[PDB]
Design a protein around this nucleic acid. Sequence first.
DNA 1: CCTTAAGAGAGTCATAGTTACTCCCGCCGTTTACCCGCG
DNA 2: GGCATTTGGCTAT
RNA 3: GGUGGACGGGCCACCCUUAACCCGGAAAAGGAACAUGUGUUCGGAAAAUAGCC
DNA 4: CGCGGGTAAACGGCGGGAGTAACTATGACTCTCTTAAGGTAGCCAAATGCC
Length: 1107
Amino acid sequence: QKTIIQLPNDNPACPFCGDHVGKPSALNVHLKRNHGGREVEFQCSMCNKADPKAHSILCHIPKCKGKVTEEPTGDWACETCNKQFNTKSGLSQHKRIAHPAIRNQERIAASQPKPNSQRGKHNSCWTVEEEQLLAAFNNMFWGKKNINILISDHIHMKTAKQISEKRRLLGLNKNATVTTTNPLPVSSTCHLKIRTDSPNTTTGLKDTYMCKINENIVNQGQIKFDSEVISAWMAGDSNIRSLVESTSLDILSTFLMETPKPRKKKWMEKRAVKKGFYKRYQHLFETDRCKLASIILDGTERLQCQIPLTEILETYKSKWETLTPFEGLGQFKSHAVADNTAFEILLSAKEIMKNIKEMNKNSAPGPDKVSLRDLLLADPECNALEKLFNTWLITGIIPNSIKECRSLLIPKTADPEALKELGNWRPLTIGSIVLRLFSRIITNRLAKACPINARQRGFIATPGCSENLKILHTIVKQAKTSKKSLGVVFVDIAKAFDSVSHDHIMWVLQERGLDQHIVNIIEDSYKKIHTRMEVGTERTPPIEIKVGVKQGDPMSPLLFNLAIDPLITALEKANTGFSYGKNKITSLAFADDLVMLSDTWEGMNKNIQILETFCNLSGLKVQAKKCYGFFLSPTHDSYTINKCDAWKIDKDSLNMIQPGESEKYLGLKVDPWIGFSKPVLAEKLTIWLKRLTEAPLKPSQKLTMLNIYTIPRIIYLADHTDTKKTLLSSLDDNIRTVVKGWLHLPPDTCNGFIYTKTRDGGLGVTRLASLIPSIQARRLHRIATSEDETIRNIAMANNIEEEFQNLWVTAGGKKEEIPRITDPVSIDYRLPRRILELLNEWEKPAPKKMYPIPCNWREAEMAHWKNLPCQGSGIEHFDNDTISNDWLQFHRGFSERQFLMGLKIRANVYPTREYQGRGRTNKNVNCRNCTASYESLSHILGQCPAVQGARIRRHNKLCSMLKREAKELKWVVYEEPHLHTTEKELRKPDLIFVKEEMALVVDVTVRFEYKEKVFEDAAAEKVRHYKDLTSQIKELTGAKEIEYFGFPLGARGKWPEINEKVLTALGMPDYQQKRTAKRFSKRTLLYSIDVINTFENIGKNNKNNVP
DNA sequence: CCTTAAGAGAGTCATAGTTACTCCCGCCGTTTACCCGCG
DNA sequence: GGCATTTGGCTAT
RNA sequence: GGUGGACGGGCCACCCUUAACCCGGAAAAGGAACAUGUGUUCGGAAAAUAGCC
DNA sequence: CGCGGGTAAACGGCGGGAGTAACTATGACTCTCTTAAGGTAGCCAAATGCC
Ligand SMILES: Cc1cn([C@H]2C[C@H](O)[C@@H](COP(=O)(O)OP(=O)(O)OP(=O)(O)O)O2)c(=O)[nH]c1=O
Ligand SMILES: [Mg+2]
Ligand SMILES: [Zn+2]
Ligand SMILES: [Zn+2]
Ligand SMILES: [Zn+2]
Ligand SMILES: [Zn+2]
């Protein structure tokens, strides 16, 4: 098993090779060095406490107190895990926390009264057999002449008065005939068809279009359209379809560019495999690295459907081409009438450009082989696109030559065994990008035209999952707290987009009110769509999409939401929801995943009835295998869970959730016992960091991948689950240790360096303990100020003002700064007010609500870093500097060793003698190859004579570089010209530049960053140094003007702006000045690294080569 | 060719907050089970 | 005319 | 003590042919699958609606 | 049989005091410190929208 090394041990011997390598830290290093892959653990010898990390046990030993393992003896023992407690309440608490199901069963048992004694001592000597016989006889003797006869005497030893008594127990006047149970048919939502004629005026949009086009023709307006086609359309042309098809074909042929041809630019040794892997990863790093992040983090390269193409063709022919019966939704109504005014204002090129800018730039093309890039290249002003889309909109036609689309299969499950079956493959359908853009524009217009029920949080402007998750959690929490019964059900529509019949969407776009013109446009957009599916290298014959909505067309989400809206509206109208105060919420929704809420079990029965009726009518099917639910009946002291019977969705037992069980919801793990199951963030984080560690992903690339691709995945779950600061801090320690291992930074490296952003000089590593609270506060503010009055009321009533205040304080905000959660939130539009008011609302970029941040925690990290006397000296120089910190983010030309050494230098944690002896009193910190008292980076790079040569070399090289720049800008250069002042001294200026008349005297110095004035003082020194050479300089060059600005350069890469003034005096343009400044910074840092390497070799390597 | 100084985080255990309940006490209100008048 | 302005990820479905 | 295991720290194998390896500041196919020893591939594969950082 | 009206005691439903297991959050302290090579060139971070 896992080998164990026990401490305290001054010089433990490794369990695998038995080498006395040193202290337990050195032993751990050696174990990771020569014994990787083999598990080791460290143990507390006096206490048998195990931990993989040696330092944990090392710090524990002093705190340890003998043999600390005695169990907490107590006469109340837990049945399952056998823990002992000294009080019944304590044992019940343990069973509650650890065994939620057992505690729930105990709660229900306590609730079940079962005293068999709730009478009141008034029970008599009546016999059950006599009771039953009297029951039968009076059923026989119902107020019919001679009504006692038998009753009086047949019951021997009784009186008719006793008969009256027992009847008064059961039946009062008579006996008790037992007849109970509720009625089944209580929905009645399948009648009263309403469709009579066109919802809106049949020419409601056609009349407006004719008026607008007449105005455009008369006044020669800017509305664009082919004259002949709209002229024929006005004239009632019979063959408008062919003519518009021809005009389309022409414009598309203009768009159907000859798209640029691809311009993308023993003997058995396993070395090849390794090389290949490295090559692959590095290539994916150089090219798109979202795929690299997916491959590494997820571990799945890419999953393709191995199912035979014949089977796929058969299934999708029987699915897409096969129709289903439709009859209308009956009483199911959808919110309210549709607003046709949204379809006024014909499409303008500005609107098309706005929509394109909001699309995905890198979208794969359809069968047209036309991408967004090509669309913009052909029509950068979108005038041709405006003409085409206006023609289609006015004529209500969409050419069939563009309907052709290509399909594909996507793995919707991560388990390859599940992927074996075809049911776990999602069919995507990608049409011509022109069609995608037109459908997106019509989708925006429709979304404004048809208002969806507010409870539908999917595919709308509100933040969806955040609102639904918070509302569900708060609903359950309030039900637990206020002793109100709650019943929750989670329902998913099967084949949401592939099972929605075109006739159903048409019906929804009927009496809703949508203009018949737009209804015709929609029907056309899903008429004669051919989607020949392609798998691997083989493509199926054409398949005619006659059922469902293309999974990938921009209008499909909106059409599905419109199709579902009657269901959500009916559920809301049923008023069976959770009675949250005066109002009551009935169903949260997100696309197809909808959760129904109720106040009683029978209320959820009614909701299930409504859902079943809707699924029967619309044709959508709800599978009971992915539907969950639970009930929260309350007790005196607490709540029971699932005390009632299971639900009967579609005549099948709904999968109820027991305490401790967790069924996922919007990526969460809703658990009836504790709301959301606490996510496994430590486990996922450890897995991801291990995957990154063991990849051909050189430390800098590892850090880039971590920062840019790993953290967000955990960010979502960490923020949406209330995640406390302690767990986030533990995750932060894990990430910090792993990152330091990647970059070989010593464990004691300042946290500020790790957490300050790359632009600020740090590594740009996210601090979860300081970011997740900020995101949480912002999310609470967003939910508080949501557009849904229901969500507002629900959340406000749960006193989330205090929660938001606590999160604001926790994130680092100030009590005073706390915004009033009810105050309006500033909205920005990324355009000037004049420009905004210059255009209509269809061309207006979507407004973005700006929510305040509790504090710039990165600024706090930088402030902490500066306060450190040793690991933050002179680090204010790199603050908010975009030049000196460029290399941290663009380090091509830095060898990985060079980049890591630069990180160490910048963080002031380079292992020098001063750093090695830092803190300890009994550890020499003198200079190893010199007599300086302290072996710091400043001395090593600026004072030690040992590296004198290297230092000179660095200076000289930098001078040469500047000279080269001056040569490029056509300046005559004099290098190190001897000059003796009036005092007959030796003053050499590094560079003398001559052009036209004026001459420039530039001296280059490289100074370590310690204090702000340092560079200023260097420049002054040079200014205070040459001066007196004025006359001499003239005689050397004949110049008429001379200047004496110096050229200081940061030893660690700082670029003072006085150097920018030097360059401006040189006449360099601003952008080239920025390029030169970045190049300098990087090259100065590289030469300082060279000096450090020369120092390291001096002495050490001298002794090694020469003992 | 240029500088003075020199912990800092990792880590555990102790103790207090606090979450979401559990236990018990006791009182007031509801239920149960006959009684009486009774046409 | 450069200038300037911006380039990235993730989650849900 | 010398070589081999791409290179370095090990650790192994041979005494030149080379079975397996761990870690790395090193590592851009002597692999896998086609095409008959020599070429290719060894996909950037994947769409949409919203939100969040 | 049906018709009401009275009935009054466990017990259960609830207000509230008293605990409490086990997280969660700081506070008070201690422990940690030599991983592994040598050279050379030092570059890639640009592309793109508007102007
Ligand atoms: C996951 C996903 C969903 N969607 C859309 C299309 C779906 O119809 C809709 C809901 O998705 P799902 O409900 O996750 O898919 P489904 O219900 O059709 O699968 P199943 O029958 O097994 O339950 O969201 C996408 O467009 N792209 C995606 O990647
Ligand atoms: Mg579904
Ligand atoms: Zn060992
Ligand atoms: Zn111990
Ligand atoms: Zn237990
Ligand atoms: Zn020295």
